[PDB]
Amino acid sequence: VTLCSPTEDDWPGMFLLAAASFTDFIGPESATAWRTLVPTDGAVVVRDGSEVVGMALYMDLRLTVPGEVVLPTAGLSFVAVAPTHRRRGLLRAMCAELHRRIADSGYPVAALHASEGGIYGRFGYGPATTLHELTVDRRFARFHADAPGGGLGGSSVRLVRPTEHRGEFEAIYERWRQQVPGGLLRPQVLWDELLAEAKAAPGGDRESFALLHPDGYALYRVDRTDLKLARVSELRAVTADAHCALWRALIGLDSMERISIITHPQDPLPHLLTDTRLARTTWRQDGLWLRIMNVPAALEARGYAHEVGEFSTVLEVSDGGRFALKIGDGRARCTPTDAAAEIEMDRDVLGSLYLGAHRASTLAAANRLRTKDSQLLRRLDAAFASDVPVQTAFEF
Amino acid sequence: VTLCSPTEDDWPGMFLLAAASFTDFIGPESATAWRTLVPTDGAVVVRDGSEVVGMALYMDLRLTVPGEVVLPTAGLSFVAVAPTHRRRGLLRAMCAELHRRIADSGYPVAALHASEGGIYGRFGYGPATTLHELTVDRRFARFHADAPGGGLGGSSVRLVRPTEHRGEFEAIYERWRQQVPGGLLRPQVLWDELLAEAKAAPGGDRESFALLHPDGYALYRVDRTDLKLARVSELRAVTADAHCALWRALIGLDSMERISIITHPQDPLPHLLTDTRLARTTWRQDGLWLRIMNVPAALEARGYAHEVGEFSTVLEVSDGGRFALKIGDGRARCTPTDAAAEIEMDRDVLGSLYLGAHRASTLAAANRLRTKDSQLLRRLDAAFASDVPVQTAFEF
Amino acid sequence: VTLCSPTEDDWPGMFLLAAASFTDFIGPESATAWRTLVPTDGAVVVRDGSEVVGMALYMDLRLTVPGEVVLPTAGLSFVAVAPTHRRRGLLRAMCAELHRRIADSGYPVAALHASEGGIYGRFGYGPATTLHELTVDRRFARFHADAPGGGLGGSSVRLVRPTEHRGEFEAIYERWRQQVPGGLLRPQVLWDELLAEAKAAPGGDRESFALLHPDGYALYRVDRTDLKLARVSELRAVTADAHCALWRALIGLDSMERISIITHPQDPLPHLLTDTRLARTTWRQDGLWLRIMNVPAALEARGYAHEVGEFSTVLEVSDGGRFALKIGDGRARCTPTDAAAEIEMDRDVLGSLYLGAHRASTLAAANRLRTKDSQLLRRLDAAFASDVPVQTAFEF
Amino acid sequence: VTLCSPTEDDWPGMFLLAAASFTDFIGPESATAWRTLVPTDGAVVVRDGSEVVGMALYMDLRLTVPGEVVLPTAGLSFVAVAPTHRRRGLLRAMCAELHRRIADSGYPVAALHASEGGIYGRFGYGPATTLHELTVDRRFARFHADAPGGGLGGSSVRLVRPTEHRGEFEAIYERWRQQVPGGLLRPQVLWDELLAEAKAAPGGDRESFALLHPDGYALYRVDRTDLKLARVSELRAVTADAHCALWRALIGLDSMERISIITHPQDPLPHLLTDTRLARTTWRQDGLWLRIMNVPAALEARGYAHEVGEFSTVLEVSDGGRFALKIGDGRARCTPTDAAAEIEMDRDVLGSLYLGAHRASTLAAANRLRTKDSQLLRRLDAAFASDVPVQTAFEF
Numbered sequence A, B, C, D: 001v002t003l004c005s006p007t008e009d010d011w012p013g014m015f016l017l018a019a020a021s022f023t024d025f026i027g028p029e030s031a032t033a034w035r036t037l038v039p040t041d042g043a044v045v046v047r048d049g050s051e052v053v054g055m056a057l058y059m060d061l062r063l064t065v066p067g068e069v070v071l072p073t074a075g076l077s078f079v080a081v082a083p084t085h086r087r088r089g090l091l092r093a094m095c096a097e098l099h100r101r102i103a104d105s106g107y108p109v110a111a112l113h114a115s116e117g118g119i120y121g122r123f124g125y126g127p128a129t130t131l132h133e134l135t136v137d138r139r140f141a142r143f144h145a146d147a148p149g150g151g152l153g154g155s156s157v158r159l160v161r162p163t164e165h166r167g168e169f170e171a172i173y174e175r176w177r178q179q180v181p182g183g184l185l186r187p188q189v190l191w192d193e194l195l196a197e198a199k200a201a202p203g204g205d206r207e208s209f210a211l212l213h214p215d216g217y218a219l220y221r222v223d224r225t226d227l228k229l230a231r232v233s234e235l236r237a238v239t240a241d242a243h244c245a246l247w248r249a250l251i252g253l254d255s256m257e258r259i260s261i262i263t264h265p266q267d268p269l270p271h272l273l274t275d276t277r278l279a280r281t282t283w284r285q286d287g288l289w290l291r292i293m294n295v296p297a298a299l300e301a302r303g304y305a306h307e308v309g310e311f312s313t314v315l316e317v318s319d320g321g322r323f324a325l326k327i328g329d330g331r332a333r334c335t336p337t338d339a340a341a342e343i344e345m346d347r348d349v350l351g352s353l354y355l356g357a358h359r360a361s362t363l364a365a366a367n368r369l370r371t372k373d374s375q376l377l378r379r380l381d382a383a384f385a386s387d388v389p390v391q392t393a394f395e396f
């Protein structure tokens, strides 16, 4: 059992383990586009001896955090242990090696999407965004008198074929991802993949359509089996007017009974309707997970709420150092100290706080973060909150 | 079609309309206890001529708002229009008369639980609390190393018969309802009802059990049909230690596959487990709805977040006046003005902001509240937030 | 194995066989009311030797046929063979003895409700009415501009407790049953039973309500398990105005998603709505079955359509005689002949034609009735049609 | 927003709107065959300005009505409004323009298949045929002793591959459609389409088989997911013997539990079995809708029942003229009059009467057609009835 960077000869073994590990992995073409995002030395394999029994890699990503700050982010992905090689510490060894490489390379944060909720906490990843599925019974849906874009005259939204408006989607998405925490830069090869998945598949997905506004788009397709359900795969709106105009058009899908979308907890959709209850939360799950690799670089990088007055404390991350933390004027200074800790928490908890998806007070009530100062808790809650609600870009 | 306060002779007509309108209403005994909370002049009926074709009333309640302030609250309930008398403006006439009486009597707020989401907005009620059902697959559930009460030695929790510990439940609930926004004073007659519903019913509900801690209780019963589901009807914990100790005991129900509870979005339960995903959000809905009857009395009554610096603005409520609003040191002054409005919103929107369940920024993005100042929005969001997460007491 | 009229000593054996044969049969009280309708010599039992292994009886009924003619009708009921005594010819022997008694007593027709569709054809019973379940999604239901009773001002319909308006229900039903083919006289003891079943049952049915109009009523109750379904157990309307007014009130059950009723194929409900498709046919089955005991007495008794000109033919019923049949001026003369048959059919087929539920042309296309004259078929179809659509009264 | 006949340049916009509007529309090939049935000037489009936001067209059809009379029929189809352009009166404007063209061109009737039941009534279309799904549990099914084709010796039915017997199917269908009201001439291009859909589809429908008799055929295929269900897509029988022989063969599909077919309410199948209840009505819906374009041309064209004696009345169609209507000897004369109306009804109601699927008495009881003469109602019911039961040909 060796742990090595893979050679070109290892990749067929890795595509076999992939196919057996992930139902979405069709074959080598499934990996081509993503693989252009893996740097030299971004991948590890474990061999028996030899055949591939374990793999893991990271991609070079750009993640938007509160204050519209973009961090270089190591996106862990393609993580698999062969079913023959369970309980042999292979995931732990692979994560320790990648984390060493990611830290040495200078990434301040790593990120991933978890197959299960019980695995990545112990490696310092905290769930940092929240997926919220809304299902609308569009047969009852009526827009509130207050809702934008109710006026008579032309619609600002067009029904279009996705493959014919690639440039407009790219430009809108680029504007979205720079202004929203959770945003990820989407490279050309991932737009190539997305537009390929928009075609009908022989005995697979139905053809995708787009609704296009100058300041937003929605991609949606009818469900393969439930012919009265339209699933929105992605809606990116840069203005409230674009968000409301796109939902007016989706609620105009008169063939459908239901429209579903995977959105975020602060989606204003329910408030656009005379009956807020028509936007039913049908599913909720962790989205992006974060591991803070360098505590001071990450805490100094993001912006903080201007509404909380200057305060200083001492934060200890369980295996991640102790820091004098001063937050004022929406910025934070985070320097080494041996002064007594006022706040303690494991690394994973800091990742859960980092984009504003989880309140310090909520984590404190579970004893995940400990302090004897309730004023300090209120100040942390306020300071770490994000003005712009955190959203989930695309899984990887 | 007259609208009158009912006489004793009207009540059999009201119990018939009740039985036909609400599946929970068994018969007159269903109304006895609640009826002691209805003041003289708390009820209206509509007669055809004569038979009862419409009814509505309010109860005298005490509602806890942020800052641990308790307001006298008119609880609208027993609202019904006969199926013979739809679309005749009976609900509008009944709500206008009760609102006139409630305002004249000096209540600063009215509240209700809505049968449907599309009815009460137009009468100025905004959804103000959020019901969040968590279902735990307790067969996988393991407590995080950080979770309180993991130590060896005696449990602080006892399994008890509800009817034998009425005093302990009453005292714990009284402590809970005074410290949590959404809390409602529960009168002796409603404890009489609750303890009656805890017995097994011939072909009805199964017997309720209690888990009792010095600082919390849970009432739960196995589902009538799904024998592997335990439903927690109520869990009131005054400390984090009590909340964690009660969940350790519920996850010790080794007969069950699943434990469900109707809780609030900030329930720390998921954070107590090594897999946060095991606490699945299975249902979400509006809970308590609020109508602000007197804008200045309500805005001056509640406490505001100390973390936002003093600010002044001008708020217009659509049919509810314009006010100079100054918020500083966690308190607000709200005085008449004819100065230009900086913020506008319908009355229902203010009720949705009032307990901190909905952010001003979220309502602004749906255009439910309008301002040209994004700094003012961030300040309102921060100021109206509740330190202690808003919860739902008991429906009425 | 003897076949005898039962003595008082046989009835406990008959109630045991009943309880084991019919899930609705609770115990002896289940039989009390119906048993007052059984004449002396109306019942047969088969004994092993001795215990009761088979039973059957008939009740004295009054059945309305086209032309508003009321026939004395033998209603076969309480028919059971012990599961120990299958395939021993017990049903055949019991039906032969009762049919001999029914014919000797002078009944022109027998009738029953069949537990299965494959049993009673061979004993000469034809399905003569059609049960049609309509389920309305009342959340979409809007009345057509043409529909009666759309005017502003008082409703003609009242929501009432069934037990307090027994006289009004009795009088309306009596008017209904005399004007509709399929109508059955309902004796006081069956009104006693119906009003007993209207109360809530401990772990059983929910409480029944009534909608009362001068010229119609509906009895309905919410489903025991599906709390958004109201089931109409009976709607009797003597005028179109009463039918429409009652449906306006049922569609005013704003708590419900769906209203279901077991009605007849010509129920005008769908035509009252702007969307006829909202009245979904969810179930169809044979209702009342008829055996013509005396062909000429039955054919001369009922009225025929005035729109067909006088015609004469020769009808042979397979074991029931050959007759010269002359139909003109809505009346028929049916006399013995040995002239060549122009029409042949088994006895069961004549019962299926008798109330107008099945067309002669439809039965001819299945070769159930044979003739070489297509003009004669059109004439029979027209003549046997019922002006007033055939309905099903109450099962027995 | 212009309304125009489309140019060749408009058709890609129309195929996009089609794909987004109809789940069956795969792509341009989906329209090729049907499009040969659209005359010059048969189509309208609405453009924003420009892109296609609305479309509608009619095909040249031949519809069989009672008396075996074949009318030129405008078949409305491909009707779609973009989800961006709801509630802008586009459907009303498109239907007004096509109806003007259809009337000017000399069509006496228009027809369509409705996506929803609430749309086409207000444009004068009445549901005129009834789809009735029968599901047979063929494991219990036994043919009545009376049923044709029970004799020993060769079967008259052959199991064949549809594509190898196109000529026999074409000839049988042509005989069927000329003798049955509802029949439609099926052009060669629609036989090309039907025989293409009979092949297995990669992850789609299973291969279709045919049962072939000299005087009838059935096309059936096993369900894609329920492998014990055979769905009959089409059964056309010109004689009762062919209908019974084909059902004997379908009930010989010993692999299947259930056979389903979409047939008409008068299908004699149930009567062929010893248990009529085995032919369960599992679904009922409106089929073909009719708009009478020229009241007198349509009323004079169809044949009437010979069994009703000569009568005269005055019929007013709400926006369609008043006529002296004389019906005798199976023919009708319908001439202009200003004499007082004896019968009134909206245009849609006349379309519902026209093929005999709905009785005048049933529509009168919903007040859809008004008269003060009950004798006149019985005469209309009898006269408009169809000797040969109305069936549905193929949807378009």
Ligand SMILES: Clc1cccc(COc2ccccc2CNCc2ccncc2)c1
Binding pocket: A022, A023, A024, A025, A026, A030, A031, A032, A034, A035, A038, A057, A059, A077, A078, A395, A396
């Ligand atoms: Cl060389 C390489 C690096 C990173 C990712 C991949 C592709 O990995 C997958 C492809 C299809 C299905 C599943 C996976 C693995 N699960 C994460 C994922 C999900 C969706 N899309 C992309 C990645 C290949």
Ligand SMILES: Clc1cccc(COc2ccccc2CNCc2ccncc2)c1
Binding pocket: B022, B023, B024, B025, B026, B030, B031, B032, B034, B035, B038, B057, B059, B077, B078, B395, B396
């Ligand atoms: Cl005189 C009176 C005043 C206020 C309330 C009531 C009781 O009203 C009900 C009782 C049982 C079922 C349903 C209702 C009405 N829906 C609100 C509600 C729900 C649960 N518990 C209490 C009230 C009687």
Ligand SMILES: Clc1cccc(COc2ccccc2CNCc2ccncc2)c1
Binding pocket: C022, C023, C024, C025, C026, C030, C031, C032, C034, C035, C038, C057, C059, C077, C078, C395, C396
């Ligand atoms: Cl002595 C006697 C004569 C006739 C009928 C009966 C009662 O028979 C039943 C009672 C309850 C359930 C089932 C049956 C038998 N199936 C027919 C039926 C159904 C509903 N209601 C009345 C009769 C007793």
Ligand SMILES: Clc1cccc(COc2ccccc2CNCc2ccncc2)c1
Binding pocket: D022, D023, D024, D025, D026, D030, D031, D032, D034, D035, D038, D057, D059, D077, D078, D395, D396
């Ligand atoms: Cl240019 C043209 C004129 C008329 C019809 C059509 C084809 O229209 C469709 C094709 C496939 C699916 C759905 C539709 C539209 N719904 C009616 C329909 C249903 C089934 N078969 C034919 C028509 C194209």
